[PDB]
From a paper:
Among all [name]-[name]-2 encoded proteins, the nonstructural protein 3 ([name]) is the largest, and it participates in many essential steps in the virus life cycle. In addition to the [name]-conserved domains of [name], [name]-[name]-2 [name] harbors a “[name]-Unique Domain” ([name]), which was first identified in the [name]-[name] genome. [name] contains three subdomains; there are two macrodomains, Mac2 and Mac3, that are followed by a frataxin-like Domain Preceding Ubl2 and PL2pro (DPUP). [name]-core does not possess enzymatic activity; rather, it functions as a binding module for viral and host molecules.
Therefore, we engineered a disulfide bond in [name]-[name]-2 [name]-core based on [name]-[name] [name]-core; the resulting mutant containing double mutations L516C-Y647C was denoted [name]-[name]-2 [name]-core-CC. The crystals of [name]-[name]-2 [name]-core-CC belonged to the space group of P321 and the best crystals diffracted the X rays to 1.35 Å resolution. After the screening of [name]-binding compounds (detailed in bellow sections), the [name] crystals co-crystallized with the hit compound 4 diffracted to the highest resolution 1.35 Å, thus was used for in depth analysis. Our highest-resolution dataset (1.35 Å resolution) was obtained by co-crystalizing [name]-[name]-2 [name]-core-CC with Comp.4, suggesting that it interacted with [name] during crystallization. However, the electron density of TF3 could not be located. [name]-core-CC comprises tandem [name]-N and [name]-M macrodomains connected by a flexible loop region. A nine-residue loop region between [name]-N and [name]-M (residues 541-549) is completely missing from the electron density map despite its atomic resolution, suggesting that this interdomain linkage is highly flexible. We clearly observed the engineered disulfide bond between L561C and Y647C, tethering [name]-N and [name]-M together. We superimposed [name]-[name]-2 [name]-core-CC and [name]-[name] [name]-core, and 257 Cα atoms aligned with a Dali Z-score of 24.1, and a root mean square deviation (RMSD) of 2.6 Å. This high structural deviation stemmed from distinct interdomain orientations between [name]-N and [name]-M in the two [name] structures, rather than differences in the individual domains themselves.
Author numbering: 417 to 487, 491 to 540, 550 to 674
């Protein structure tokens, strides 16, 4: 019913051409699905938004289902039951920001309406901004920075006289990825995954995108690069790690 394959997307197409993607209420692709869509028009995903959980859109080789965020496992199962019975290449549903575990996803796919081929898929610290900047500078790790956070921008401008801060990668003094809250956490995670650099970072989405620390920890599971994650205090180190022990 569910088979974990050892192959890349292209190397799995011999089994089936059909891909099952996960989207949110607005038709935005989950980070795990966002990389499976190259050279395909995806206008249809957002064209009919907003959706409700369980809605399914299809075009060509692609099927996409709107999935929930865990509070429930029953709601994730109910959403997957709407996918037409077929054979699909996919990823485990509900990972990353949505908050489900791999075992929860397996439980849901165990119900076996369709057949699924599942593609294959650093210490936490409490460092202040001065410490993070110094660490980035010497290690050459990429440091995401929200440019709306003026206190950070001001610090960077004082440390690296002459830096011209703008959105995107800026490599001046240290290597920064400057972003704003006006793009999604998913898009930021996908960009950082594509850059394929080790990070030194605060939890992504925390505060800037309205996420609490647990929600941000869930999203951080979608990173496919190593990351030194720096949290607000020693007590937050324990909390954050606990969110990941789950």
């Amino acid at each position: 019913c569910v088979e974990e394959v050892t192959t890349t997307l292209e190397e799995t197409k011999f089994l089936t051409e059909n891909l099952l993607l996960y989207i949110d209420i607005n038709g935005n692709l989950h980070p795990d699905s966002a990389t499976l869509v190259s050279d395909i028009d995806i206008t249809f995903l957002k064209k009919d938004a907003p959706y409700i959980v369980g809605d399914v859109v299809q075009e060509g080789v692609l099927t996409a289902v709107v999935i929930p965020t865990k509070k429930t496992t029953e709601m994730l199962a109910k959403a997957l039951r709407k996918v037409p019975t077929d054979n699909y290449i996919t990823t485990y549903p509900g990972q990353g920001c949505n908050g489900y575990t791999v075992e929860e996803a397996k439980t849901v796919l165990k119900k076996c309406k369709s057949a699924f081929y599942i593609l294959p898929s650093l210490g936490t610290v409490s460092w202040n901004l001065r410490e993070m900047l110094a660490h980035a500078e010497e290690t050459r790790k990429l440091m995401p920075v929200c440019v709306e956070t003026k206190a950070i921008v001001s610090t960077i401008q004082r440390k690296y006289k002459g830096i011209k801060i703008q959105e995107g990668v800026v490599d001046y003094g240290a290597r920064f990825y400057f972003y704003t809250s006006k793009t999604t956490v998913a898009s930021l995670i996908n960009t950082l995954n594509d850059l394929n650099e080790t990070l030194v970072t605060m939890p992504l989405g925390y505060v800037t995108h309205g996420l609490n620390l647990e929600e941000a920890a869930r999203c951080m599971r979608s990173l496919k690069v190593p990351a030194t994650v720096s949290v607000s205090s020693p007590d937050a180190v324990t909390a954050y790690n606990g969110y990941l022990t789950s």
